[PDB]
A paper describes a structure:
AmvA abundance in vivo is transcriptionally regulated by [name], a [name]/AcrR-like regulator that senses cellular polyamine levels and enables the dynamic modulation of amvA expression in response to fluctuating growth conditions. The overall fold change observed in [name] is characteristic of the [name]/AcrR family of transcription factors and consists of an all-helical regulatory domain (α1–α9).
To understand [name]’s response mechanism to polyamine, we first determined the crystal structure of an [name] protein derived from [name] at a resolution of 1.88 Å. A single [name] polypeptide chain is situated within the asymmetric unit of the crystal and forms a homodimer structure with its corresponding partner in another crystallographic lattice, which is consistent with the results of size-exclusion chromatography. The second and third helices of the DNA-binding domain exhibit a classical helix-turn-helix (HTH) motif, with the recognition helices (α2) playing a pivotal role in sequence-specific DNA binding and being separated by 55.6 Å in dimeric [name] (measured as the distance between main-chain carbon atoms of His46). In its ligand-free state, the DNA-binding domains of the [name] dimer adopt a dimeric arrangement, maintaining their association, but exhibiting a long distance between the two DNA recognition helices, similar to the arrangement observed in the ligand-bound state.
Residue numbers in the entry:
A (entry chain A), B (entry chain A): 8 to 192
Write the structure that this text describes.
């Protein structure tokens, strides 16, 4: 589990300071091990960053599954980021940071796509559960709706980054609710 | 109109080769003028690039208004990029190129936002015309729907750029049609 303890040290630095601080020197110091042992367990510094990122993203999904919901409508708001739980703010800060690194880090590029597919599958699962429970309609198939919901929230957050003048960031929940309602009721 | 002829030369280089080729030396040669006259008429090389970009974007809207449509449903597909007119491919190539430059060019940053607002207002106008003509419903206000439609298509195209494995780019029209139908019928 000494490899796991190195990973846990990288995850702490990632959550608190981001990817650039995640040098092998720093991680070895934090895990109280040698840089030689970090290199033994991980093929590259970028492999370690991506593996810690994926662990933190799996951890984000775990945390999200402990918020109490009564409906799949509620769980969709959480999965789509419309509820801004304060616990998850450093997790989302890392996610946005990873999004910028996929254009210069091959391992982070692959890990980001794996996390995207995991996110899509968690939305599919919530949609299909809501349909099975009688809460959601099924005018379109669940895979199509999930990609459209992800596309919407990523696009809306992309437009917020522009700093446009007639667009209030505080409307994100209201817009996301409207789209969820139109797609599923 | 000698200033206008310099602008037209910059627009030709922009459409054919992109922003990096738009040096003052190159534009002066193409407009058959002196670099001194280019500097007289334009405050900076980046001012010239942004002014030519905005002219080409206004030109894209003009071209789009000449495609014959029978419904506002059809015009929305065109405005949202779902119909891939071959004429507009170099215009859209420049638009995506500008999107990358807003993080290092202050004038392109401002011009891109102006074009975004112009795009939003053209969608608002189409929505409100379709509602006035009896073709569209009005469950939400036209400004809200327009931002959501722009957010969707930008988000969908952003997800296409990732190179995910279970996502077919050829589905863009089908997804955009579904969202238009849900928002407006």
């Amino acid at each position: 589990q000494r490899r796991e303890m190195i990973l846990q040290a990288a995850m702490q630095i990632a959550l608190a300071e981001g990817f650039t601080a995640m040098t092998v020197r720093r991680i070895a110091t934090e895990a109280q091990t040698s840089t030689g042992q970090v290199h033994h367990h991980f093929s590259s510094a970028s492999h370690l960053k991506a593996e810690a990122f994926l662990k933190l993203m799996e951890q984000l999904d775990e945390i999200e599954q402990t918020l109490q919901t009564t409906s799949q409508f509620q769980r969709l708001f959480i999965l789509l980021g419309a509820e801004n739980i304060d616990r998850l703010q450093p997790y989302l800060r890392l996610w946005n940071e990873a999004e910028l690194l996929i254009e210069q880090d091959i391992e982070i590029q692959k890990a980001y796509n794996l996390a995207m597919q995991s996110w899509h599958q968690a939305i599919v699962q919530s949609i299909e559960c809501g349909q099975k429970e009688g809460e959601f309609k099924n005018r379109s198939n669940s895979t199509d709706i999930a990609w459209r919901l992800i596309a919407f929230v990523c696009g809306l957050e992309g437009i917020y980054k522009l700093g446009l003048q007639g667009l209030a960031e505080e409307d994100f929940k209201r817009h996301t609710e409207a789209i969820i309602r139109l797609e599923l009721l």
